[PDB]
Design a protein around this ligand. Structure first.
Ligand SMILES: Nc1ncnc2c1ncn2[C@@H]1O[C@H](COP(=O)(O)OP(=O)(O)OP(O)(O)=S)[C@@H](O)[C@H]1O
Ligand SMILES: [Mg+2]
Lengths: 572, 279
């Protein structure tokens, strides 16, 4: 109301013009002139201004912007347009209206946190895009209506993900895709809808956010949020010669033994480097893990721990997972009735991890759709006249139980598990767990279990010999390693691997390229564990060792002894 | 209008056939005959009507059989990308004058089909009975090709080196090897050639093809009679029509109004190498 006064309004407009034409960065460069030159070169229609600098320079503007967003933003758009006209008179020929974008709002709020008090106020929110509409013209302009759900990782268990509507105009149109995690800065306005009033029986306003700035939530934001103390602790950990041992021992403290399974799962978690050689073929940088186990080996416990640790994680069961559920599907909107895409579990697992429990229960028809996403990490949906492509870069961990409930060592791994050969081929790491009656191991298991039971009472609330790391420290290490390291394989001896692969061919025909690729990305991940920009051959040796162990574990008993004798050089 | 002169210059060279063959999937090692067959399928023949109302097919049909790993799906994808109209299925109305690729074989459309062996891998000693399709549906295909995993110690090394070089050098540079035509340029050239004109055979070529057809029919006779077994790939007048169509496509590639004896000879050689080896 006070802003609507003409005098203060005009004075603030000219003050904002002086801010545009007067601000100086710490390096002595007028940033906005470079930004406007870049926009003119790119013929864009929007201008991005940092809220932090405006708050630092003009406190009154920073106070006014969240309170009177629409009028002040229109005034700033007019000021930017006239500044552009004064600086670039010809720019009226390419564009007729220029919009100001506000970025980095200090106040970030969740979709659950939306109340009445935030109505008609600028709010910053975070979420994941689920469905989007097309480009619609208006007799005023470009229109986009999208549906946003809360990020599954942030959502607590047992409570449904809530959904909201968002509107994008002109430049913001087509700036996002379904299944993409984004944060928004926009106005929380209310809309009048008589259908809701009739249905509920009282006045109801459907609140829809009109976003001003859209930013995809890449891990760059997470990198920025990292404290320098976290970085120094991670670097101090990296120089330790036994960093790998403590990292492996830090996973599943409550479970005793089973070094190979935790080794493989950590190695898959750290992930490799995806590559696109030539833009002609794409080599995946992801590890798919299969865990076949006799009952009583705490496979579900491992899956649950992985679910908790991961920043982004989705848990699914065998029986409740249909082909339509796992993937995105086409549906007619109940209100507007245009074809829309709803993302499945794998789509929301993009850049995250997906866990499959009781994978042996999968129907073959449901299995068929899995191979495409496993091999190409992308899904092509061709339904109801709509053909779309969606990213499916996810790390898949699957659990399985042998047919009959007991693993037979006298049979091949293919025979014991009711899965087709291509599915197993897509998996990079295979781990089989058996049950043996060893009195000393039984003593160790019983003692560790009873000790853990005593420790974790609510009233009361290693094999390598290394102290496990704190959970938060491990998570921070994982994030930093994922977002900083990019190893290079410039010191690999091709003759040794070629001879080993020839021997592998000999002893496999006696009983492929993707195995080589899996070993390569495994070495890359092991290098990423040590935070090394270049790969040392020790990573290659360890990857060879673990891959050979996994391969021999899948063979019959009559041949694994000969395999161990032949390959005693590498296993030692 | 300027592109018409470019297409005329490209088609007036004495080596258009070799350039087109090299332009068909330069990444894939070998298969020069398969590349030429794919090229002439893409160019295609010409349809002719008759006053009695009857129409004769102006499109070519090819079938491929071989062990897995012979790069069959890659050729189908390349054909679908290169063709102005292209459909790819996993096993027709929306395609008019285009090419339809059909994997797992076990309306004016050219058909390119891929299939696998009955037992999974080819058995040379068993000979016949490795194809489950009936002769009735096999007769429609103009040509049939058989690919086998020719295991050579040096050939595997060469293939691995070629694949690794393709993997490595692809980000570095994307350039034609020796005068290869761009995908868009080749697409426009094929469209222009198809739209512009369609050739017809000659009397001498017709007589030569008739004599060769009679000789080949007698040979297929004698092979069947001596073998005391019915061949799964019979030879009928449809094979003669297919050879005529291939010769017409070869003449169309040169935009000549009348086909020459060289086109008929090349068509006969390709038909021999495909069908007679397959049969
Ligand atoms: N090696 C182990 N060390 C410690 N506790 C274990 C171990 N194996 C099993 N347990 C305990 O046994 C409980 C039940 O194990 P489960 O996870 O149900 O067995 P499972 O191996 O997953 O086979 P299924 O999937 O249940 S048929 C776990 O929650 C653990 O508390
Ligand atoms: Mg379990």
């Amino acid at each position: 109301e006070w802003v609507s006064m003409a005098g203060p309004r005009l004075e603030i407009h000219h003050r904002f013009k002086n801010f545009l034409r007067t601000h100086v960065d710490s390096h002595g460069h007028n940033v906005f002139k470079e930004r406007i030159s870049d926009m003119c070169k790119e013929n864009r229609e929007s201008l991005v201004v940092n809220y932090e600098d405006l708050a630092a320079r003009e406190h009154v503007l920073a106070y006014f912007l969240p309170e009177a967003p629409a009028e002040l933003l229109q005034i700033f758009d007019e000021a930017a347009l006239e500044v552009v006209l004064a600086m670039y008179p010809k720019y009226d020929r390419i564009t007729n209206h220029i919009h100001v974008r506000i970025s980095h709002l200090p106040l970030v709020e969740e979709l659950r946190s939306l109340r009445q008090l935030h109505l008609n106020q600028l709010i910053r929110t975070s979420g994941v895009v689920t469905s989007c509409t097309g480009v619609l013209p208006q007799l005023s302009q470009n229109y986009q209506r999208i549906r946003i759900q809360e990020s599954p990782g942030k959502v607590a268990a047992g409570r449904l993900p809530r959904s909201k509507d968002a509107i994008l105009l002109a430049d913001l149109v087509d700036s996002c895709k379904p299944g993409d995690e984004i944060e928004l800065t926009g106005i929380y306005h209310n809309n009048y809808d008589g259908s809701l009033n009739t249905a509920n029986g009282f006045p109801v306003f459907a609140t829809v956010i009109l976003a001003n700035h859209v930013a995809k939530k890449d891990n760059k934001v997470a990198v920025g949020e990292l404290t320098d103390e976290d970085v120094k602790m991670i670097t101090s950990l990296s120089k330790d010669q036994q960093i790998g041992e403590k990292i492996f021992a830090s996973i599943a403290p409550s479970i005793y033994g089973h070094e190979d399974i935790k080794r493989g799962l950590a190695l898959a978690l750290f992930g490799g480097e995806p590559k696109n050689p030539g833009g002609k073929h794409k080599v995946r940088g992801d590890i798919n893990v299969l865990l076949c186990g006799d009952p009583g080996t705490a496979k579900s416990q491992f899956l649950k721990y992985i679910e908790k640790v991961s920043s982004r994680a989705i848990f699914t069961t065998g029986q409740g997972a249909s082909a339509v559920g796992l993937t995105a599907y086409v549906q007619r909107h109940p209100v507007s009735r245009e074809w829309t895409l709803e993302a499945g579990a794998l789509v929301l697992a993009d850049r995250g991890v997906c866990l499959i429990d009781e994978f042996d229960k999968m129907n073959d028809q449901d299995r068929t759709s899995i191979h495409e996403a496993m091999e190409q990490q992308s899904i092509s949906i061709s339904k109801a006249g709509i053909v779309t492509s969606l990213q499916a870069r996810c790390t898949v961990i699957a659990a399985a139980n042998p047919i009959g409930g007991r693993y037979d060592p006298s049979l091949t791994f293919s025979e014991n598990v009711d899965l087709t050969e291509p599915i197993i081929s897509r998996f990079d790491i295979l781990c089989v767990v058996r049950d043996t009656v060893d009195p000393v191991q039984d003593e160790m298991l019983a003692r560790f279990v009873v000790g853990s039971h005593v420790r974790h009472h609510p009233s009361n609330k290693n094999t390598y010999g290394v102290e496990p790391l704190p959970q938060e420290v491990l998570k921070k290490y994982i994030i930093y390693a994922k977002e900083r390291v990019h190893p290079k394989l410039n010191q690999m001896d091709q003759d040794k691997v070629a001879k080993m692969y020839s021997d592998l061919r000999k002893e496999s025909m006696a009983t492929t390229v993707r195995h080589i690729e899996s070993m390569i990305r495994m070495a890359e991940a092991h290098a990423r564990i040590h935070l090394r920009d270049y790969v040392i051959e020790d990573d290659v040796n360890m990857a060879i060792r673990v891959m050979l162990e996994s391969f021999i574990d899948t063979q019959k008993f009559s041949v694994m002894r000969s395999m161990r004798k032949t390959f005693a050089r590498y296993l030692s | 209008p300027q592109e018409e002169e470019e297409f005329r210059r490209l088609a007036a060279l004495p080596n258009v056939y070799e350039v087109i063959s090299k332009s068909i999937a330069p990444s894939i090692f070998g298969g020069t005959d398969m590349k030429k067959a794919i090229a002439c399928l893409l160019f295609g023949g010409s349809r002719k009507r008759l006053p009695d109302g009857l129409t004769r097919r102006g499109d070519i049909n090819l079938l491929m059989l071989g062990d897995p790993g012979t790069a069959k799906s890659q050729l189908l994808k390349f054909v679908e990308k290169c063709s102005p109209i292209g459909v790819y299925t996993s096993g027709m109305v929306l395609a008019d004058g285009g090419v339809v690729c059909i994997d797992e074989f076990d309306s004016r459309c050219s058909v390119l089909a891929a299939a696998n062996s009955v037992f999974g891998r080819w058995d040379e000693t068993k000979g016949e009975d490795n194809i489950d399709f009936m002769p009735t549906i096999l007769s429609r295909f103009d040509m049939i090709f058989i690919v086998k995993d020719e295991h050579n110690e040096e050939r595997d090394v060469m293939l691995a080196k070629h694949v690794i070089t393709l993997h490595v050098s692809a980000l570095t540079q994307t350039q034609a090897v020796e005068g290869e035509i761009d995908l868009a340029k080749l697409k426009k050239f094929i469209a222009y050639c198809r739209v512009k004109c369609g050739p017809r055979l000659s009397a001498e070529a017709a007589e030569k093809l008739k004599n060769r057809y009679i000789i080949m029919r007698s040979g297929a006779r004698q092979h069947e009679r001596d073998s005391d077994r019915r061949s799964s790939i019979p030879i009928t007048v449809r094979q003669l029509e297919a050879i005529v169509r291939i010769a017409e496509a070869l003449s169309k590639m040169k935009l000549q109004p009348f086909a020459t004896e060289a086109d008929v000879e090349e068509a006969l050689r390709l038909f021999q190498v495909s069908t007679l080896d397959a049969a």
